[PDB]
Design a binder for this molecule. Structure first.
Ligand SMILES: COc1ccc(-c2ccccc2C(=O)Nc2cnn(C)c2)cn1
Lengths: 156, 39
């Protein structure tokens, strides 16, 4: 299987044609996506198989082949980039200043960018190209637009 | 049955399209991992 670092599309043929259900990040031999994209199912890369290693429906994260590797954090000040991979469209960077999800357990970065559901799992970057979290879990707002948490996992 | 395809390198790109606002929102996170607006 293809184990090169980078961003990947997650596809199914279980519907009409080939359908993009989400996106993920390959780093250090581990594939990282959001739980709602795979529901913890195994993945094919060519003839290779990727089996789930770690997951959590509440964090809405899942790792394949190995434990979560992405430990970078939004600094709470600097702009970031959503490396969006929309269905049928080229990878495209979109630069933004995150807002804030205020919760009883603490504050989280949020990005207010509107993309199809199949873009879930697209990484969010800091200025040094480090992944600070994944796009695709959040809330529909007063307007009707989508706001996504910057969802990051713990590295052990 | 789900498969992956490479779509690019993970790089910061100088002079990307700069858009989106920065809203401060009160949210709850339930046991199913669904966020919601606390108003
Ligand atoms: C109901 O209307 C929509 C349409 C689309 C989206 C959406 C937009 C951008 C990125 C992810 C999503 C998304 O689907 N997230 C999600 C989280 N949990 N589940 C089960 C789905 C949200 N709401």
């Amino acid at each position: 299987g293809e184990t090169t670092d980078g961003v990947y599309r997650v596809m199914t043929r279980r519907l009409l044609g080939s359908t993009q259900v989400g996106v993920g990040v390959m780093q250090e031999g581990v594939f990282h996506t959001m739980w709602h994209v795979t529901k913890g199912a195994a993945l094919r890369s060519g003839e290779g198989r990727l089996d789930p290693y770690w997951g959590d429906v509440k964090q809405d994260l899942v790792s394949y082949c190995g434990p979560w590797k992405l430990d970078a954090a939004w600094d709470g000040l600097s702009e970031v980039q959503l490396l969006a991979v929309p269905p049928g469209e080229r990878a495209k960077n979109i630069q933004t200043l995150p807002g804030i999800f205020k919760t009883k357990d603490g504050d989280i970065g949020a990005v207010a960018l509107d993309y199809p559901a199949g873009t879930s799992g697209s990484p969010i970057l800091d200025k040094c190209g480090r992944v600070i979290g994944l796009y695709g879990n959040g809330v529909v707002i007063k307007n009707g637009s989508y706001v996504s948490a910057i969802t990051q996992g713990k590295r052990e | 049955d789900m498969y992956i395809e490479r779509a690019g390198d993970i790089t910061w790109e100088k002079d990307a399209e700069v858009t989106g606002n920065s809203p401060r929102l009160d949210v709850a996170l339930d046991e199913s991992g669904d966020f919601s607006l606390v108003e």
